[PDB]
Amino acid sequence: MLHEIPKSEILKELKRIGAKRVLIQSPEGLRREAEELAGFLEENNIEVFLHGEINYGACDPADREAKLVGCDALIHLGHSYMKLPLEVPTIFVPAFARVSVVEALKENIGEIKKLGRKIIVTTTAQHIHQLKEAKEFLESEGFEVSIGRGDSRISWPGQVLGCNYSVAKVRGEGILFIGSGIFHPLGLAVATRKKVLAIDPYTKAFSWIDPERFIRKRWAQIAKAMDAKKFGVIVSIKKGQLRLAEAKRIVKLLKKHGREARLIVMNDVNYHKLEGFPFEAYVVVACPRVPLDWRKPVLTPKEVEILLGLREEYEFDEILGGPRESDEPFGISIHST
Amino acid sequence: HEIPKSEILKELKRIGAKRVLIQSPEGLRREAEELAGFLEENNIEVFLHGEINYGACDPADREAKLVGCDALIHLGHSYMKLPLEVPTIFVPAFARVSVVEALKENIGEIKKLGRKIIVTTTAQHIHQLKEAKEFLESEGFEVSIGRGDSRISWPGQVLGCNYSVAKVRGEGILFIGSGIFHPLGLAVATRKKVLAIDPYTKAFSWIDPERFIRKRWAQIAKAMDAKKFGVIVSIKKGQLRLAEAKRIVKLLKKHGREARLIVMNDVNYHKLEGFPFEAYVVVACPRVPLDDYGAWRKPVLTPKEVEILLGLREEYEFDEILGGPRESDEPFGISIHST
Ligand SMILES: C[S@@+](CC[C@H](N)C(=O)[O-])C[C@H]1O[C@@H](n2cnc3c(N)ncnc32)[C@H](O)[C@@H]1O
Ligand SMILES: C[S@@+](CC[C@H](N)C(=O)[O-])C[C@H]1O[C@@H](n2cnc3c(N)ncnc32)[C@H](O)[C@@H]1O
Ligand code: SF4
Ligand code: SF4
């Protein structure tokens, strides 16, 4: 369960810009909420279109789509703004989980002490509004809590994304991750080379990350691709995911190492669409969680650098930004370019 | 019958193209890359469009503009009238099969259509239409071939959304080609006797639209209970039906029901699964709700079937996407268009 959508404040903002037609995108967990909000915005004399795509991140604003169907503004549900040009005014509506992370921490004090005294703390957007609490709880348990600001991909200090761990590139003895799943903790472990403890707030269960099984798993993908002469190098037109330059360099780099390479342009990168092409292996230069989560081997940019013998240590593929001057609000935000 | 790589290279070389994007449908994925390597051998940077293209109603010109491509190559289909943001070379696919042989085999069934007949085929046999015409006249028929509107590329060519080439004077309609969908489309859109002849198998079928129209009445009945409706547009350039979509939303509301306009690119159920809507209306390619093998677990309707459900239409009508008048005809070969 989440905190309820702030329907009133969104309309107050929409009324401020006198928007008449709005497109609302939403991720898989907020489909019922999207229509729920559309009914409320229509009840206040505003036309609403729902974006039928399943959204995966603020890296994919549907602003262009909003323009093509003549919407004044864009409502983006469930994610916080990351730095992007926006062709229409966009209201970002972050989702905040109500679960108590301090309760989850108090259950696992013993495990956290194993990380060290000075510890780096990280969480995902659903728990970011409780990061102040967790810091205060940990400091009251003798910890020095180090939280990184992160870069322009990131909306709040201490926030991680599947594609970015800049908040964890600060001084510290170990990393605590507050959230569900193992991809973020795995990525933190690989990216920082530090011990990572992952605590799931919904179950209070904990997890000591060991990336070796994941890295071995990836190396078989690399080894399987070692015999391939025909590579496809994939970009995504999603605005915060397009990495044309880097993809071109991978193409150039493969050709310069006796391989054939073709740049491939997609929106949603999914293998099922590629099965007819003649390529023997693939490199995704987009959302890193796509190859890291296909009947032919699919590699990240870093991994193809390893395959070519230009890099030795394994590296998570991250999309970085530059410096971020200010922090997104713990609430709805509105941006335009 | 070939991908004329040389004619394509020369078109590109003329217009100063240096970076090109190539679309392909499912059956020409390998040819797309062979062409790409050819053009690259000739100092032209080439990207492939990783999407699977389902027709010329879906040009990748905006995508090409996004990645700095100064031209688009669209393999496997012919031009339909659409604005395009980059020069685009259409490379239609043409089947080799001689069709006259299948006509002669079945000349007795063809005569059952009447003296004056309407002759139609798909794009991959459109070059055979001149031969089929001369033959059928030489056997005594009078051969009427409709020109079609601006979504059609050549006279006598039918598309899954468009049977305008068949809306001409004539007793019955002959269709030359394989498969069921197109003949069935002709029968419903013209309510005329339709004879289909497969040029590969020399097999014939007299199309009865009975079972099809019954299955569609079945769908409409499943929606009579529905209170909440999703009305879908696809932003594919040649499919976007925004005004016709808004009209259905206004109509559904004007008849008690709730209705919401849903914007998508590729239309399929899985993406809408989380929504609360009890039934869907697709205002786009009509072959999405009509040619559904059962991926849609909720009732999905065409605009015309909606008017039947709200009680505004008596007889079933095929949902077509109609263009304006076509002043010229596309070549039998590659075409190049910029707008
Ligand atoms: C669901 S989002 C995760 C939420 C949040 N953005 C985060 O940082 O963790 C990531 C998932 O979306 C899917 N995804 C992201 N970009 C994609 C793309 N361009 N094509 C296909 N799938 C994509 C991948 O399956 C990936 O595992
Ligand atoms: C090969 S395409 C049609 C080719 C050609 N234009 C014609 O008229 O026959 C046929 C299939 O494409 C699919 N299709 C068309 N538009 C689509 C869309 N916007 N989203 C998902 N599927 C689509 C439909 O399911 C349909 O059965
Ligand atoms: S790039 Fe991938 S992980 Fe990063 S925000 Fe977008 S979908 Fe999420
Ligand atoms: S039938 Fe559907 S896929 Fe074929 S041309 Fe018409 S809209 Fe495009």
Swiss-Prot record, chain A:
Its EC number is 2.5.1.108. Gene3D superfamilies: Diphthamide synthesis DPH1/DPH2 domain 1, Diphthamide synthesis DPH1/DPH2 domain 2, Diphthamide synthesis DPH1/DPH2 domain 3. The keyword Nucleus does not apply. Pfam families: Diphthamide_syn. Binds 1 [4Fe-4S] cluster per subunit. The cluster is coordinated with 3 cysteines and an exchangeable S-adenosyl-L-methionine. [4Fe-4S] cluster binds at residues 59, 163, 287. One of its GO terms (molecular function) is 2-(3-amino-3-carboxypropyl)histidine synthase activity. It is an enzyme of class 2 (transferase). Keywords: 4Fe-4S, Iron, Iron-sulfur, Metal-binding, S-adenosyl-L-methionine, Transferase. It catalyses: L-histidyl-[translation elongation factor 2] + S-adenosyl-L-methionine = 2-[(3S)-amino-3-carboxypropyl]-L-histidyl-[translation elongation factor 2] + S-methyl-5'-thioadenosine + H(+). GO terms for biological process: protein histidyl modification to diphthamide; S-adenosylmethionine catabolic process. Changing residue 59 to A: Still able to bind a 4Fe-4S cluster. Less active than wild-type. Not able to bind a 4Fe-4S cluster and loss of catalytic activity. Its cofactor is [4Fe-4S] cluster. Pathway: Protein modification; peptidyl-diphthamide biosynthesis. NCBIfam families: arCOG04112 (TIGR03682), diphth2_R (TIGR00322). Catalyzes the first step of diphthamide biosynthesis, i.e. the transfer of the 3-amino-3-carboxypropyl group from S-adenosyl-L-methionine (SAM) to the C2 position of the imidazole ring of the target histidine residue in translation elongation factor 2 (EF-2). Belongs to the DPH1/DPH2 family. Homodimer. Unlike the enzymes in the radical SAM superfamily, Dph2 does not form the canonical 5'-deoxyadenosyl radical. Instead, it breaks the C(gamma)-S bond of SAM and generates a 3-amino-3-carboxypropyl radical intermediate. Thus, the P.horikoshii Dph2 represents a previously unknown, SAM-dependent, [4Fe-4S]-containing enzyme that catalyzes unprecedented chemistry. Moreover, the chemistry requires only one [4Fe-4S] cluster to be present in the Dph2 dimer, although each monomer can bind a [4Fe-4S] cluster. This is 2-(3-amino-3-carboxypropyl)histidine synthase. The lineage of its organism: Archaea, Methanobacteriati, Methanobacteriota, Thermococci, Thermococcales. The gene is dph2.
